């Protein structure tokens, strides 16, 4: 449990201390998607399913149209400014 | 039958040109109106809170959320009859309020993920459904691409959408890895006696509400609801209100809730006072929007609320929805007009309204006194049942700061009256154009129910104690 | 595959009236509307292009009154269809829960369940399916008419449970 | 030049237009339409003329519904 | 009684076209005959939602 | 055989060794190649502590896609007290190898099938989205 | 004639007020399975995930 | 849903022990729910076996203490 927990938790205090460089906000909320992933995937190992699978097969796939979503907003993001 | 709209028409739009755009969101106008008529006995699917747990312990439809599930193609039909229809026709409002090819579509993406969280008895739909309508609102505040507000309001959101998505997904985590469901059948009073589950739903409580603007959290989607185009805003600042809370109304997971009512506390007070000393109109009516939520956290803490929430409901999404559509005709009035996404910022600007004409003055006056409680109206009997809820259960300090934020609050909400009538020096005698028909016709009905909807308060009540129970 | 062997619900109504169902089959959906159903179909389909026709007679798009494009007809007319269907269905198997009034459907699934357990087949059919997919599948369809106004989702399964007395 | 007739002109004209044209497009769909449409007109027919289905495989040990009879032999 | 009810909804129709003319500012009478249509729609759903309460009550005379 | 004993201890520091040069970089580009390997760490203890399916499923689709998808994006720039060990029996009920991988395939297309129904306009909606911003038709 | 009408109107509302503390109580009585979820499907009884069972799971 | 089923798609761990709470539920109303606890408690060391982790520690004090 602890390796999600310590992913998950450093990511958000990456992400609290480390505003104005922005593309460091994504990654370090896509490591936060992989570690509720690492505290699930244990979850559905530990207690003989795979229901927790069921939700961390899902949330990989809205973790990767998150990252599909917004870099486009990104990209919004630049087109009005140069840099 | 969104589904069944949004498989058609996303083909259809792509199979169309670009001058279309205004007859698409006619067709879809008249859709949703005929989906609430033609389909409206289904309220008969009940009869003494009978619920349906439909797709396999999946969705949850019951005597509830059925109205909800109403609500939003009611205001769906007004919001898309704003585009579907011009207000004149003049160059300016064909340069302003032009919408774009995806618009319409990303709208019922947005309903789909609305409706996905209230009828969701898992939280995995939940989890997917909430994801929607974040994607959704990303979408839609970054779709007016070419303003750097705009874009820098889909990233503010866009961070604040991501913190929360992991939160909510942290809380699910947690309480699967103390207990082997999703599902909440498995609270039923029994579980709460013995295992402390209190830290983890209030975890996912908080979760939920701080993308609301939950008073925390809570300078971020006011920069938002102005650094939006001025009608985006009419859509994004009500639709993840009455989702999420009307989940968080049906499955009372945090009752008695020390977190949630110190909380409520702070929410009242600081949008009461945050409202005061503003001249962006924007921000004022954002403020407005945050204390009506205030109202929301103190439905959450109780318990068996469905008539003071469904009520402060279709009072909130016609009130508040009416304010923007005056004001948006009030653009017409004024003598300045910067900013072609966001044409009325400062309140100063609507200065002589009054001596435009008396009646879009006196259907705004009636609305923001209808923020305000004013007893002969619809938005005071929100109010009052709230309160005939709140001394329910024993809420009492709640109830005094209740008292004190509905003051500051009427202060703030005349300062637009304030404005309103006063000297102009320079009035109308002749217009050329009027205002489309029935685009003005809309809120001439949307002000009759606010002014004569204590007509049907018995009928209602009625209506509550047969289906409801 | 024939048992059901989950606990079921037994002559449970909805309404004040007696049941059927709890999932019609799509077929017998079909087959049982009445015939003034087919006028709500009917007048749906052609309360779209009419409706697009009044929408421009009240506010032109660029202040002119003209009629549209027959391509915004078409799909007008097939979403009309669309809603008239919805409404058919809709309209149709409340009658199996007892909700609303059951008085011919009564008589004629007195007739047809009769009709088969004469011809001595299932009371229903045979899916093609084992019978803990035909509990799964028909755990997706129950109660599905309600929320129509989200998603249509409908019974194509035959399985062997309905809320009967018996079988 | 093959601009367009339009769809909603004369369909099967259409059709013969695109197959024509752009086989890129229609050349997918209609092995695309031909799935659902066979898949749905075909199968009551092999069950009739061709043959029927087969056995549900078992998925476990299969539990007949008895009463625990008197079984003899093997106590020592 | 029905027609009663009937009579204020359609009231509350002509208070809408008679303040969405105010809006447009046009005079009173303006268009008289969206008066009739005002006239209809809303007293339509005093000929539904009195349909609905009567269907109420009954229930509750049904479980006594 | 004891230095077999640690290996999960061994990537958990691994991990946070490599999270702290996320938050530590100079251009942008070199934090998300410290991502790449901590993506890579996670598969290694996803293959370690059981889940070899999903280490794969990871390395196809987080530095399959999404990383791959970064790393593509920031080129275009301009200028710049639990020690229990747990009991593991063996019984005989199971038939045939329907691993994670099949269950995952009965339980998304059988009990849960609404939810990959709405994952279809998620993933429309992702289809969508960037033709809505990035192309400004006419 | 007065005290009459008064007398219909006060039964009338106490009518009402028993009219609405009943409705209360039947708010917070104890609702069955059968209306809280699903009609059909009386058990909450899960038996799930049957294809690896074993004899000997119920209790 | 994905109530009862395992890695295999069989029944998980503690799958008896959810059925006999669930039938420690479905037999019962509210305001009687306090004897459904002991079918409850059966669950919960289940998952975490905090009662097992209290019994184990104690035998292996003893055991180090000779």
Not at chain 2, 234 to 259: A, G, Q, R, T, W
Not at chain 3, 47 to 71: M, N, Q, T, Y
Not at chain 6, 36 to 64: E, N, P
Request: some cysteine; overall charge positive; hydrophobic content about 50%.
């Amino acid at each position: 449990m602890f390796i999600g927990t310590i992913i998950l938790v450093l990511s958000f205090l990456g992400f609290v201390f480390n505003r104005r460089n922005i593309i460091l906000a994504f990654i370090c909320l896509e490591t936060m998607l992989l570690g509720i992933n690492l505290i699930l995937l244990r979850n559905s190992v530990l207690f003989d399913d795979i229901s927790g699978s069921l939700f961390a097969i899902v949330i990989i796939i809205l973790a990767g149209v998150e990252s599909a979503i917004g870099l486009s907003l990104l990209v919004s993001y630049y087109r009005l400014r140069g840099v | 039958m969104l589904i069944l709209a949004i498989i058609s028409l996303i083909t259809f739009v792509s199979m169309s040109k670009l001058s279309d755009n205004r007859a698409i969101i006619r067709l879809i106008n008249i859709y949703l109106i005929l989906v609430l008529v033609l389909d409206s006995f289904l309220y008969l699917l009940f009869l003494n809170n009978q619920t349906y747990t439909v797709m396999g312990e999946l969705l949850i439809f019951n005597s509830f959320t059925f109205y909800i599930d109403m609500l939003i193609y009611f205001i769906m039909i007004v919001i898309s009859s704003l585009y579907g229809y011009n207000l004149y026709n003049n160059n300016l409002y064909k340069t302003l309020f032009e919408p774009k090819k995806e618009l319409i579509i990303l709208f019922l993406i947005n309903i789909l993920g609305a409706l996905l969280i209230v009828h969701s008895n898992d939280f995995i739909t939940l989890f997917v459904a909430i994801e929607l309508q974040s994607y959704s609102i990303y979408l839609i505040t970054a779709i007016y691409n070419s303003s750097y507000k705009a874009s820098k309001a889909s990233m503010l959101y866009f961070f604040m959408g991501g913190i929360l998505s992991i939160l909510i997904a942290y809380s699910i985590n947690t309480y699967y890895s103390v207990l082997n469901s999703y599902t909440l059948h498995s609270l039923d009073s029994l579980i709460i006696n013995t295992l402390d589950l209190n830290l983890i739903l209030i975890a996912l409580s908080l979760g939920l509400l701080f993308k609301i603007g939950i008073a925390p959290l809570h300078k971020w989607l006011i920069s938002i609801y102005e650094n939006t185009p001025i009608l985006i805003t009419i859509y994004i600042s009500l639709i993840p209100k009455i989702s999420i809370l009307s989940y968080l109304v049906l499955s009372n997971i945090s009752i008695n809730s020390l977190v949630i009512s110190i909380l409520a506390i702070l929410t009242l007070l600081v949008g009461s006072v945050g409202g005061l000393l503003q001249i962006k109109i924007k921000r004022l009516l954002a403020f407005s929007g945050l204390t009506n939520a205030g109202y929301m956290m103190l439905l959450l803490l109780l318990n068996n609320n469905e008539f003071s929430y469904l009520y402060y409901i279709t009072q909130y999404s016609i009130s508040h929805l009416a304010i923007f559509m005056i004001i948006i005709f009030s653009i017409y009035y004024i003598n300045y007009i910067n900013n072609q996404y966001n044409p009325i910022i400062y309140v100063n600007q609507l200065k002589g309204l009054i001596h435009d004409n008396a009646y879009l003055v006196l259907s705004m006056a009636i609305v923001v006194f209808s923020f305000i409680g004013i007893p002969p109206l619809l938005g005071f009997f929100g109010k009052l049942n709230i309160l005939m809820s709140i001394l329910n259960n024993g809420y009492y300090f709640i109830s005094i700061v209740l008292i004190v934020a509905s003051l500051i609050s009427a202060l703030y909400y005349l300062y637009l009256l304030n404005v309103s009538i006063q000297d102009k020096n320079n009035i109308l005698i002749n217009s050329n154009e009027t205002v489309s028909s029935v685009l003005s016709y809309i809120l001439s009905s949307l002000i009759i129910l606010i002014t004569f909807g204590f007509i049907y308060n018995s009928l209602i009540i009625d209506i509550f104690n047969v289906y409801f129970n | 595959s024939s048992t059901p062997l989950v606990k079921t619900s037994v002559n449970y109504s909805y309404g004040d009236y007696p049941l059927i169902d709890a999932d019609p089959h799509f077929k017998r959906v079909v087959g049982y509307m009445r015939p003034s159903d087919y006028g709500v179909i009917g007048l749906a389909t052609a309360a779209l292009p009419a409706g697009i026709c009044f929408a421009e007679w009240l506010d032109p798009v660029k202040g002119k009154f003209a009629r549209p494009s027959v391509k915004f007809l078409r799909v007008a007319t097939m979403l009309g269809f669309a809603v008239g269907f919805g409404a058919a269905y809709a309209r149709s198997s409340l009658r199996f829960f007892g909700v609303t009034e059951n008085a011919r459907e009564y008589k004629k699934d007195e007739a047809q369940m009769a009709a088969r357990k004469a011809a001595g087949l299932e009371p229903y059919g045979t899916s093609s399916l084992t019978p803990e997919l035909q509990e799964i599948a028909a755990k997706n369809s129950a109660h599905s008419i309600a929320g129509l106004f989200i998603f249509p989702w409908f019974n194509f399964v035959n399985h062997p449970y309905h809320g009967r007395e018996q079988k | 030049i093959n601009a367009n007739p339009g769809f909603w002109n004369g369909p099967f004209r259409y059709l013969r237009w695109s197959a024509h044209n752009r086989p890129h497009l229609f050349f997918a769909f209609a092995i695309g339409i031909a799935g659902p449409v066979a898949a749905l007109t075909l199968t009551p027919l092999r069950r009739k003329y061709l043959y029927p289905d087969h056995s549900p495989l078992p998925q476990s040990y299969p539990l007949p519904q008895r009463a625990r009879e008197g079984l003899t032999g093997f106590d020592d | 009684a029905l027609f009663t009810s009937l009579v204020g909804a359609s009231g509350l129709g002509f208070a809408t076209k008679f303040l969405s003319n105010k809006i447009r500012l046009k005079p009173a009478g303006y268009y008289p005959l969206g008066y009739v249509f005002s006239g209809v729609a809303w007293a339509g759903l005093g000929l539904v939602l009195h349909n609905v309460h009567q269907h109420s009550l009954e229930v509750l005379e049904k479980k006594k | 055989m004891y230095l077999t004993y640690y290996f999960i201890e061994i990537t958990i520091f691994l991990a946070i060794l490599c999270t702290i040069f996320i938050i530590s970089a100079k251009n942008p580009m070199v934090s998300i190649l410290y991502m790449i390997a901590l993506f890579v760490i996670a598969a290694m203890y996803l293959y370690l502590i059981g889940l070899g399916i999903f280490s794969l499923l990871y390395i196809m689709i987080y530095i399959g896609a999404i990383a791959v998808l970064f790393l593509f994006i920031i080129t275009l720039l301009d200028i710049n007290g639990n020690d229990y060990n747990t009991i593991i029996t063996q019984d005989w009920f199971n038939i045939e190898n329907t691993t994670l991988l099949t269950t995952i395939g009965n339980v998304l297309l059988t009990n849960n099938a609404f939810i990959l129904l709405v994952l279809a306009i998620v993933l429309l909606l992702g289809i969508i989205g960037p033709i809505s911003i990035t192309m400004k038709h006419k | 004639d007065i005290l009459n009408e008064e007398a219909k109107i006060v039964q009338a509302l106490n009518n009402q007020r028993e009219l609405t503390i009943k409705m209360h109580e039947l708010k917070r009585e104890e609702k069955d399975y059968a209306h809280s979820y699903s009609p059909l499907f009386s058990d909450p009884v899960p038996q799930g995930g049957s294809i690896g069972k074993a004899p000997g799971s119920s209790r | 849903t994905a109530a009862g089923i395992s890695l295999t798609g069989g029944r998980n761990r503690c799958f008896s022990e959810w059925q006999s709470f669930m039938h420690c539920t479905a037999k019962t109303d509210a305001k009687s729910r306090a004897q459904c606890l002991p079918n409850f408690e059966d669950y919960m060391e289940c998952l975490h076996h905090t009662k097992e982790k209290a019994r184990l520690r104690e035998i292996e004090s003893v055991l180090k203490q000779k």
